[PDB]
């Protein structure tokens, strides 16, 4: 199966920028979409950003529209999210994620702490 590896993140104050990455290990030029769920305690994993196996097509949730980017690095299998003027309520945990086939089910990496001070 998939194996996502996930660097980056960590302690930021409000207002600064991190760069979380995560990788297909040992793909290239692989097909999955990749992309970043965020978790707080309490409630369901939610879809932050997304990028298809392309790099053609891209999807945010509102909340982080016009501040973070995710890109991709075709070539080393390897997505980026970078994540500008970062607040409070961007404490989260975040989890690569890639889609199982068709089904709506993902693949998981192991999830990166981002905590804004």
């Known amino acids: 199966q998939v194996k996502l590896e996930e660097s980056g993140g960590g302690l930021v104050q409000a207002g600064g920028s991190l760069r979380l990455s995560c990788a297909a290990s040992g793909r290239t030029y692989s097909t999955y979409a990749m992309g970043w769920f965020r978790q707080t305690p309490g409630k369901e994993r939610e879809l932050v950003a997304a990028?298809?196996?392309?790099?053609?097509?891209?999807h945010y949730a509102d909340s982080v529209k016009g501040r973070f980017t995710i890109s991709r690095d075709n070539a080393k299998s390897t997505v980026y999210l970078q994540m500008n003027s970062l607040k409070p309520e961007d404490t989260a945990v975040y989890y690569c994620?890639?889609?199982?086939?068709?089904?709506?089910?993902?693949?998981w990496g192991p999830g990166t702490q981002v905590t804004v001070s």
């Open positions: 990028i298809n196996w392309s790099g053609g097509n891209t």
């Open positions: 994620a890639a889609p199982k086939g068709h089904t709506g089910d993902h693949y």
